[PDB]
């Protein structure tokens, strides 16, 4: 009938393993081929836009926190593309779960060849690594790609990856089984969502980079990674007495570090 409802989770500061991000497929069309621009810039004909229907794009994944990069960007391994951009590659990020603060993001940039020794950004997308209540993102996510720009790692990001937006979530919930199934009704409703989707395909030149996050499994359980800090349970033993000690001093019984620095330099 069904396994139980227990919610299992691990603290992010307890999961000392590298974060891994799957770069799935890049759906959508590119910015056509504006031949006006090529007459102005002949180097532009020697660029992935104009050489193949699917240039061999690559993605760089970098983690940012407080607008600063936590480590170097990781690049997808070369994959030759012909009719679709499908890297299908798990990227081991240089950051571990304990290393990630609550506002850690991954800035993902799709890059293309622009003449010799020059990559142009096809687009960029940034998604926060923790959810609205501090749970590491799980499973398959489709991120809005911002054309002709690198992913922005600043806080707040200017390239967030997160009608069809709402419906896709409901569709994913339906496919996972969280939405109730009604065959007569699902058959009719999804045709409309398809019409909406096709209209959005024609209306806008949007691209989506589908990515996936790893699932933490142990004994066939599913653990969500919730953001925590070690000692996060240490509710400080604050007490409101001031009978004798009216003026607390935090440095009270502490090594004088300016004298020890001096000791270490004179003696």
């Amino acid at each position: 009938m069904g396994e139980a409802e227990k919610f299992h989770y691990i603290y992010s500061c307890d999961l000392d393993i590298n974060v891994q991000l799957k770069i799935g497929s890049l759906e959508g069309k590119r910015e056509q081929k504006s031949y006006k621009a090529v007459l102005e810039d002949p180097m532009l004909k020697f660029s992935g836009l104009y050489q193949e229907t699917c240039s061999d794009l690559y993605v760089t994944c970098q983690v940012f926190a407080e607008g600063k990069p936590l480590a170097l960007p990781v690049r997808t391994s070369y994959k030759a593309f012909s009719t679709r951009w499908n890297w299908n590659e798990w990227l081991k990020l240089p950051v571990k779960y304990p290393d990630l603060p609550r506002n850690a993001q991954v800035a993902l940039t799709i890059w293309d060849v622009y003449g010799p020794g020059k990559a142009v950004p096809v687009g960029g997308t940034t998604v926060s690594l923790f959810g609205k209540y501090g749970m590491f993102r799980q499973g398959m996510h489709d991120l809005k790609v911002w054309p002709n720009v690198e992913a922005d790692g600043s806080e707040p990001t200017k390239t967030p990856g997160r009608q069809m937006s709402r419906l896709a979530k409901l569709t994913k919930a339906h496919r996972q089984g969280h939405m109730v199934k009604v065959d007569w009704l699902d058959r009719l409703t999804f045709r409309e969502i398809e019409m909406i989707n096709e209209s959005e395909k024609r209306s806008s030149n949007f691209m989506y980079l589908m990515v996936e996050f790893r699932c933490v499994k142990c004994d066939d359980k599913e653990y969500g990674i919730v953001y925590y800090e070690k000692d996060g349970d240490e509710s400080s033993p604050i007490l409101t007495s001031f009978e004798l000690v009216k003026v607390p001093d935090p440095q009270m019984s502490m090594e004088n570090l300016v004298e020890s620095k001096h000791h270490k330099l004179a003696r």
């Binding site: 419906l167 409901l170 939405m179 009604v182 007569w184 009704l185 409703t189 409309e192 969502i193």
Partner: protein, 382 residues
């Protein structure tokens, strides 16, 4: 899997005999709707006179010393066009043609103390922007208490009562027609909107997008929309003219079952009788569904959907010519056509003398029918 069509279904094999137990004349003008509290303790009527009157169902049963409305509310203003109890007898929502939607708190009262109405959250609709409310249904979405309502300017708004926000809003295509009535799925999965031009348009409430719009072949106004107690994809429409209560599969838009109580030949789009069914009560009962209709012709009919030949008229004197009921197949649709059969003074007719605007049933000890008329008369039938 476990949605109940009614909280208190009628007694097994219940066939209302039609004895008048309460003639209640307390509104100045037409009553528009009767809603029965989900536990059936109370029933409420709204009226063009601008009042809401709450009635104690428990006090119609064999102790009718004074059949009085326990409560009257008249502060909303305008013509109170629709109302609904909110799954528990503590809240009753009413709407006016002025634009006000008001939640009213009915207080349970021990007879030593008198009862009262206290208004709770009120909403006023701009006549230009949203119009007045034309239909309103309450349902409990587990988490929420959605008071869904439809407005003249095509918006079918889901108002959460335990908050003050909307759970959803559905902008109905007014090209289809004016919303006259709408029905919500017992499983809270889909709704159907009936318009003034006969369009019945379906919405998926899980995704909140429209999925179907079948129109009546004659473009006859939809006076009532009820979901089918048996078929999830079906909706029962009460139509303008012929006392037509047709059943429509919303998965295909086909007519499946029609009630025809008219001089016109069945399903004929030529000359409709002026009469219409204004209120419908359907129950699954013991798996043999029934349907009570009332309307313009002032006749309360009982249609045995499983055994149409047993269909009969509840209200209406025996001096009026008797009727017979025939199940036929016209286009392929099965039709239960009604055909006319060619102590002091006469006992006073107990029936309604003006258009019966609505039908409701409640269970206290036995089954009772409540019908209201366009003159403000509410009648309880044991």
């Amino acid at each position: 899997e476990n949605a109940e069509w009614e909280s208190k279904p009628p007694p097994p094999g219940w066939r209302p005999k039609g004895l008048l137990v309460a003639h209640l004349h307390e509104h100045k003008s037409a009553v528009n709707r009767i809603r029965v509290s989900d536990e059936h303790s109370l029933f409420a009527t709204c009226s063009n006179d601008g009042t809401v009157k709450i009635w104690n169902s428990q006090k119609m049963e064999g102790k009718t010393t004074t059949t009085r409305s326990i409560l009257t509310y008249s502060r909303i203003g305008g013509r109170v066009k629709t109302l609904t109890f909110c799954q528990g007898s503590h809240y009753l929502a009413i709407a006016s043609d002025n634009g006000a939607v008001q939640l009213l708190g009915i207080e349970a009262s021990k007879l030593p103390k008198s009862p009262k109405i206290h208004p709770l959250q009120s909403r006023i609709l701009d006549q230009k922007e949203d119009g007045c409310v034309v239909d309103m249904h309450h349902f409990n979405s587990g988490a929420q208490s959605v008071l869904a309502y439809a407005t003249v300017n095509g918006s079918l708004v889901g108002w959460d009562l335990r908050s003050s926000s909307n759970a959803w809003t559905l902008k109905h295509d007014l090209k289809s027609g004016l919303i006259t009535s709408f029905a919500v799925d017992i499983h809270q999965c889909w709704l159907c909107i009936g318009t003034s031009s006969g369009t019945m348009a379906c919405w998926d409430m899980r995704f909140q997008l429209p999925i179907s719009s079948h129109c009546h072949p004659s473009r006859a106004r939809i006076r009532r929309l009820s979901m089918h107690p048996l078929y999830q994809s079906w909706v029962i429409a009460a139509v303008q003219g012929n006392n037509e209560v047709s059943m429509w599969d919303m998965e295909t838009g086909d007519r499946r079952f029609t009630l025809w109580a008219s001089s016109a030949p069945p399903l004929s789009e030529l000359q409709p009788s002026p009469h219409s069914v204004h209120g419908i009560y359907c129950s699954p009962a013991d798996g043999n569904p029934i349907l009570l209709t009332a309307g313009s012709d002032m006749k309360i009919r009982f249609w045995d959907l499983a055994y149409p030949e047993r269909s009969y008229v509840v209200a209406g004197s025996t001096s009026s010519p008797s009727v017979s009921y025939y199940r036929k197949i016209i286009e392929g649709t099965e039709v239960v056509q009604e055909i006319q059969n060619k102590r002091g003074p006469e006992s006073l007719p107990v029936g309604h003398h003006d258009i019966i605007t609505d039908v409701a049933t409640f269970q206290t000890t036995q089954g009772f029918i409540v019908t209201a008329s366009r003159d403000g008369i509410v009648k309880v039938w044991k």
